[PDB]
Amino acid sequence: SILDTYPQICSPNALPGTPGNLTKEQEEALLQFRSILLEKNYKERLDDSTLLRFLRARKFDINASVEMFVETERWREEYGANTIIEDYENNKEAEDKERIKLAKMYPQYYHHVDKDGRPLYFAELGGINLKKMYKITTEKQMLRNLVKEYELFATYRVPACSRRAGYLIETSCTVLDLKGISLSNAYHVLSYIKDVADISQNYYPERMGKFYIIHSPFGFSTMFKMVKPFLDPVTVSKIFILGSSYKKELLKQIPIENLPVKYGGTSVLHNPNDKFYYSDIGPWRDPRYIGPEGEIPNIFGKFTVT
């Protein structure tokens, strides 16, 4: 019944095939799709938003969308995606302690929203030392962190952002900062990149909104040609590799007051001693927009800047 407490139709100005914005044939396809899944005895994740994400990923080919959804449900159960938040909460102290070890080296933080109300997400790669990374974490651990974030996005960020926007929010506005990376390191982590792409595209269809790659070094175009082969055409269409004019491009999409100063905006933490890489600021922290789902857990424990 949580779905009844936030908007379940997108902005009328959203992309085709989104909730509330369907053609008659798309409406009929959705009804047929839900009917097949109900008949197969699925009960959860049958809402308009979820099912239309799958339909869009397979161009409203109902049989292909069924195969995709069924396989996703299989994965969620086998992997533990259905209990990942609960499992984290039951081992919070230990998991937080480990997460904080990586935060400074690999900043990953949400910070308000874009102009459409999408959670605004930043990740910085240039401080990563691969040798040190491999000694404090594992690839599988990082993939767990990704899956846990997808679940937190869906249970906490979506409801609050949708209530604020006045319409359903389904996707992220992401900024990936590559300032200071070595292209050698980039090639070395290709298999990890593929694992992220595989989980994202197979089990979390249509979660990408905007994906900006900034401060990429010369020669990044070459490296990205090793990534493209395992990205679906729709995925490629969401990724924008920006140049020296990146600040101007970000400002078309993101309110100036929501963009950190170093990226050309005016956003500054309230205590300038606080760190962005421990921060989690957005509508999901505002009592006005938190609903029956409750407030998101603090991913950086006591260090979490809210």
XYZ file of C-alpha atoms in Angstrom:
306
model
C 0.000 0.000 0.000
C 3.114 2.235 0.100
C 2.597 2.903 -3.640
C -0.637 4.685 -2.683
C 1.352 7.358 -0.809
C 3.350 8.705 -3.757
C 2.611 9.544 -7.417
C 2.548 6.549 -9.788
C 2.375 8.586 -13.004
C 5.413 10.297 -14.520
C 5.534 13.916 -15.653
C 3.388 14.387 -18.791
C 6.650 15.659 -20.338
C 8.546 12.401 -19.792
C 9.801 9.897 -22.395
C 7.384 7.633 -24.340
C 6.279 4.358 -22.691
C 6.438 5.789 -19.138
C 3.612 5.473 -16.508
C 0.701 7.779 -17.435
C 2.144 8.534 -20.883
C 1.145 5.414 -22.832
C -0.457 4.844 -26.215
C -3.494 2.541 -26.328
C -1.396 -0.381 -27.638
C 1.122 0.175 -24.804
C -1.715 0.200 -22.243
C -3.031 -3.101 -23.641
C 0.470 -4.623 -23.607
C 0.881 -3.678 -19.924
C -2.448 -5.314 -19.050
C -1.544 -8.465 -21.009
C 1.905 -8.547 -19.374
C 0.524 -8.269 -15.829
C -2.094 -10.929 -16.653
C 0.563 -13.471 -17.718
C 2.641 -12.801 -14.596
C -0.391 -13.114 -12.291
C -1.250 -16.437 -13.978
C 2.329 -17.684 -13.309
C 1.729 -16.801 -9.627
C 3.899 -13.695 -9.253
C 2.635 -11.284 -6.613
C 5.298 -8.649 -5.970
C 6.778 -5.934 -8.234
C 3.755 -5.944 -10.563
C 3.138 -2.191 -10.301
C 2.908 0.023 -13.418
C 6.394 1.499 -12.902
C 8.205 -1.854 -12.549
C 6.431 -3.577 -15.435
C 6.796 -0.651 -17.838
C 10.551 -0.575 -17.087
C 10.715 -4.195 -18.349
C 8.416 -3.511 -21.314
C 10.526 -0.490 -22.391
C 13.730 -2.582 -22.127
C 12.270 -5.107 -24.602
C 10.378 -2.641 -26.832
C 6.963 -3.875 -25.584
C 7.627 -7.423 -26.857
C 5.434 -9.092 -24.231
C 7.018 -12.562 -24.448
C 10.549 -11.108 -24.175
C 9.464 -8.965 -21.209
C 8.007 -12.043 -19.479
C 11.318 -13.927 -19.950
C 13.213 -10.926 -18.592
C 10.987 -10.438 -15.517
C 10.947 -14.172 -14.673
C 14.734 -14.377 -14.904
C 15.038 -11.241 -12.715
C 12.766 -12.746 -10.062
C 14.968 -15.876 -10.124
C 18.108 -13.762 -9.653
C 16.648 -11.646 -6.829
C 15.840 -14.751 -4.804
C 19.129 -16.598 -5.461
C 21.330 -13.546 -4.888
C 19.538 -12.285 -1.764
C 18.387 -8.978 -3.314
C 14.988 -9.442 -1.616
C 16.580 -9.325 1.862
C 19.665 -7.165 1.223
C 18.463 -4.112 3.188
C 17.241 -6.274 6.109
C 20.531 -8.252 6.115
C 22.505 -4.989 6.122
C 20.478 -3.620 9.065
C 21.065 -6.845 11.042
C 24.843 -6.392 10.609
C 24.906 -2.575 10.393
C 27.879 -1.781 12.649
C 30.312 -4.127 10.894
C 29.175 -3.149 7.374
C 29.367 0.583 8.162
C 32.898 0.184 9.572
C 34.065 -1.383 6.297
C 32.146 1.063 4.065
C 33.822 4.063 5.718
C 37.280 2.640 4.861
C 36.551 3.112 1.143
C 34.527 6.356 1.240
C 37.478 8.791 1.021
C 39.299 6.776 -1.659
C 36.143 6.269 -3.757
C 33.604 9.053 -3.135
C 30.050 7.893 -3.859
C 27.351 10.311 -2.768
C 23.869 11.560 -3.532
C 23.412 15.329 -3.289
C 19.909 16.713 -3.905
C 18.215 16.372 -7.325
C 18.362 17.443 -10.982
C 15.820 19.800 -12.642
C 13.351 16.933 -13.165
C 13.616 15.767 -9.529
C 15.901 12.753 -10.151
C 18.251 11.879 -7.273
C 21.576 13.503 -8.172
C 24.514 11.120 -7.772
C 28.274 11.721 -7.793
C 31.117 9.222 -8.028
C 34.797 10.189 -8.149
C 37.378 7.713 -9.495
C 40.659 9.679 -9.499
C 41.699 8.987 -5.893
C 41.402 5.205 -6.303
C 44.618 3.281 -5.691
C 43.920 -0.206 -7.063
C 46.472 -2.026 -4.886
C 45.021 -0.466 -1.715
C 41.446 -1.064 -2.931
C 41.991 -4.807 -3.425
C 43.398 -5.097 0.108
C 40.369 -3.521 1.839
C 37.486 -4.696 -0.410
C 36.575 -7.321 -3.043
C 34.805 -7.073 -6.416
C 31.914 -9.142 -5.041
C 31.607 -6.796 -2.037
C 31.418 -3.797 -4.394
C 28.726 -5.519 -6.469
C 26.786 -6.169 -3.230
C 27.090 -2.426 -2.490
C 25.667 -1.699 -5.950
C 22.706 -4.042 -5.472
C 22.037 -2.653 -1.986
C 22.033 0.861 -3.489
C 19.501 -0.170 -6.176
C 17.248 -1.463 -3.399
C 17.676 1.686 -1.271
C 17.027 3.794 -4.379
C 13.738 1.981 -4.963
C 12.511 1.853 -1.372
C 13.594 5.314 -0.081
C 14.823 7.692 -2.762
C 12.029 7.092 -5.303
C 9.095 7.640 -2.864
C 10.511 10.860 -1.385
C 11.697 12.334 -4.688
C 8.325 11.519 -6.288
C 6.408 13.217 -3.452
C 8.586 16.313 -3.831
C 8.350 16.436 -7.653
C 4.591 15.796 -7.669
C 5.170 12.982 -10.168
C 6.803 9.552 -10.332
C 10.624 9.564 -10.367
C 12.232 6.342 -11.693
C 15.842 7.187 -12.569
C 19.103 8.845 -11.498
C 21.066 11.850 -12.695
C 24.653 10.594 -12.440
C 27.970 12.414 -12.674
C 31.092 10.209 -12.956
C 34.282 12.219 -12.380
C 37.390 10.684 -13.997
C 39.839 13.471 -13.106
C 43.170 11.910 -12.131
C 42.577 8.325 -13.309
C 45.117 6.239 -15.177
C 43.847 4.635 -18.378
C 45.973 1.601 -17.531
C 43.858 1.110 -14.383
C 40.687 1.537 -16.469
C 41.604 -1.426 -18.704
C 42.515 -3.493 -15.649
C 38.972 -3.165 -14.233
C 37.077 -3.955 -17.477
C 35.711 -7.236 -16.091
C 34.321 -5.417 -13.034
C 32.725 -2.794 -15.318
C 31.088 -5.630 -17.274
C 29.713 -7.155 -14.057
C 28.145 -3.799 -13.112
C 26.679 -3.426 -16.611
C 25.327 -6.989 -16.485
C 23.503 -6.580 -13.140
C 22.238 -3.128 -14.177
C 20.912 -4.117 -17.604
C 19.641 -7.601 -16.727
C 17.976 -7.002 -13.371
C 17.448 -3.228 -13.080
C 16.199 -2.211 -16.523
C 15.548 1.467 -17.304
C 17.020 2.855 -14.049
C 19.449 5.142 -15.934
C 18.261 8.718 -16.494
C 21.292 10.862 -17.265
C 24.874 9.582 -17.016
C 27.626 12.185 -17.468
C 31.283 11.250 -17.698
C 33.440 14.279 -16.860
C 37.173 15.026 -16.770
C 37.961 11.945 -18.886
C 41.630 11.901 -19.950
C 42.671 12.025 -23.612
C 42.596 8.418 -24.827
C 39.414 7.626 -22.885
C 37.515 7.346 -26.197
C 39.722 4.326 -26.986
C 39.129 2.716 -23.598
C 35.338 3.263 -23.865
C 35.395 1.215 -27.096
C 36.142 -1.810 -24.851
C 33.017 -0.987 -22.772
C 30.459 -0.336 -25.553
C 30.258 -3.991 -26.773
C 28.529 -5.094 -23.543
C 26.200 -2.078 -23.311
C 22.739 -2.145 -24.856
C 21.871 0.638 -27.391
C 19.524 2.361 -24.906
C 22.297 2.338 -22.257
C 24.750 3.959 -24.707
C 22.139 6.663 -25.477
C 22.077 7.740 -21.791
C 25.847 8.212 -21.492
C 27.345 11.617 -22.302
C 31.123 12.016 -22.351
C 31.627 15.750 -21.730
C 34.518 18.040 -22.670
C 36.025 21.279 -21.373
C 32.489 22.775 -21.504
C 31.125 20.220 -19.013
C 30.047 22.862 -16.460
C 27.709 24.436 -19.028
C 26.220 21.020 -19.875
C 25.661 20.120 -16.202
C 23.945 23.497 -15.631
C 21.350 22.757 -18.345
C 20.257 19.723 -16.344
C 21.014 20.480 -12.688
C 19.947 23.496 -10.553
C 22.982 25.654 -9.740
C 22.304 25.496 -5.969
C 22.394 21.669 -6.155
C 25.762 21.423 -7.916
C 28.974 21.400 -5.818
C 31.218 24.468 -6.284
C 34.050 22.464 -7.916
C 31.650 21.523 -10.750
C 30.513 25.116 -11.339
C 27.608 25.432 -8.892
C 27.040 27.047 -5.491
C 26.351 24.050 -3.226
C 28.449 24.027 -0.049
C 28.010 21.739 2.978
C 26.623 23.539 6.045
C 29.679 22.629 8.069
C 32.634 23.216 5.669
C 34.576 20.747 7.847
C 32.191 17.976 6.685
C 33.027 15.751 3.689
C 30.926 15.112 0.572
C 32.092 11.468 0.583
C 30.269 10.944 3.895
C 27.175 12.841 2.738
C 23.672 11.687 1.811
C 21.561 14.826 1.343
C 18.231 14.877 -0.510
C 14.418 14.755 -0.328
C 14.679 11.335 1.401
C 16.083 13.232 4.423
C 13.183 15.716 4.559
C 10.326 14.860 7.000
C 7.935 16.542 4.528
C 8.711 13.830 1.947
C 9.416 10.697 3.995
C 6.396 8.354 4.088
C 5.455 4.993 5.673
C 8.682 3.448 4.283
C 10.504 5.395 7.014
C 13.879 7.085 6.690
C 16.777 5.539 4.792
C 19.527 3.919 6.945
C 22.765 5.884 7.361
C 25.338 4.268 5.069
C 28.352 5.947 6.678
C 27.163 5.294 10.260
C 27.915 8.146 12.690
C 29.878 10.007 9.979
C 26.806 10.334 7.707
C 26.186 13.974 6.764
C 22.441 14.484 6.305
